[PDB]
Symmetry: C3
């Protein structure tokens, strides 16, 4: 059974928010994509690099998350430290992800180039930084998820199966 | 707050004395065309020496409060091209989107665009961007990336840059 | 510049230990470079196992002892744990050339969305350019077609040999 980590990074949501629209967008998108059974491991944390690092390490090392997706804290603002935390915990970066996510975003907004979203591997776990807006989250995942089930196969993880009328992963 | 913008021409030849710094001029001319808000250029010509480039950038960011610093020169595969190493050394986090788009923009016209090591990053609240050498390329490069720069500076709580929208339209979401 | 060009070709394979392994990738590289070049050059060719220390050694020998102006690798550039070619390349290079990885992934993403899984990179060690290529002969050729037009000029800038090409097949770009 596949375990997928979902991390909402936000001082605001950590302090208390009516709802977590970002985390929800990730869960709903994954539910739309996946016909195979999967289990979300979900945390809401503040913009604190040490905490983000700890959370990702726990998900990958102890909770066997084959994929971990983060949302928030990827811009130029002083407290946006999610990419740094990601780089800190991953041994092998995946530069193709950031490239594509920015390229797709750039079709809409020239500020796409301000995103420091990245991705990498910690051991057998893929970690991908997503943006904050639900619209953007779906657009982002639509672009990169088709490569993800195959990536997990190559890491000797669970075989993810998709609703091919919603998304078509290449293998 | 009154905006200060650093302009660094990196060049052994220029540092020894040349007729005119056309790359630096291209930067200042373009920024003049873009900007309606008042701003102060802080300009330095320095040699291709990594440590000197580092010191120059650190001063402009830390002491002179430059919200944007742009460099021209020293960004290819040649031994003495050390502007990107200097930029990476002084920045606390990189802005990979800039190197991507600047290469893509240059690649429109020259296959050797992929040899460019031009990059960008943040040192505290200062954005540092490595630009190309030729005036035509500098303008095309700025046309491509500058639309994102005023919003970047807004996010770093810096001065509000105001632009001539007939010339350039910065995006602010 | 007048000096005879040496180009390194490194095949990284989990079957390298077997003399009966048929290296179709290394062959595709050699064949491609022969199609491309009209100037005199010599291939320096090694098939090696996917052991990062060995890949590092091979690259360093080719760059530092055998005067290879260009070294191309094939194999070991995906997300699997055993794929350590980019780490070796990063280890031996003193500065990276991010434009190569961008272009190669872009040329590949034209065909497969798993293009973003490639960790192929490129860098300089001293005056030697090192570029990670893919595995399949078709992908190897497509890759080289995309990036090789910038390579002779790169070598010119590092004061290496002047490479000359068969312009019926590939046209290097050289600016002022
Ligand atoms: Na794991
Ligand atoms: Na060398």
């Amino acid at each position: 059974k596949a375990k997928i980590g979902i991390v909402t990074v936000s001082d605001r949501a950590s302090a208390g928010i009516y709802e977590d629209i970002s985390g929800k967008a990730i869960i709903d998108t994954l539910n739309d994509y996946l016909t195979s059974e999967w289990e979300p491991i979900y945390q809401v944390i503040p913009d604190e690099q040490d905490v983000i690092e700890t959370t990702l390490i726990k998900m990958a090392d102890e909770q066997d998350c084959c994929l971990i997706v983060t949302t928030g804290g990827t811009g130029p603002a002083k407290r946006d430290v999610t990419p740094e935390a990601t780089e800190a915990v991953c041994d092998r970066m995946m530069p193709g992800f950031g490239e594509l996510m920015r390229a797709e975003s750039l079709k809409f907004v020239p500020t796409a180039i301000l995103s420091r979203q990245t991705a990498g591997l910690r051991g057998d776990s893929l970690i991908v930084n997503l943006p904050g807006k639900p619209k953007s989250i779906r657009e982002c995942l639509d672009a990169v998820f088709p490569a993800i089930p195959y990536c997990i196969d190559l890491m000797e993880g669970p075989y993810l199966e998709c609703n091919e009328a919603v998304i078509k992963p290449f293998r």
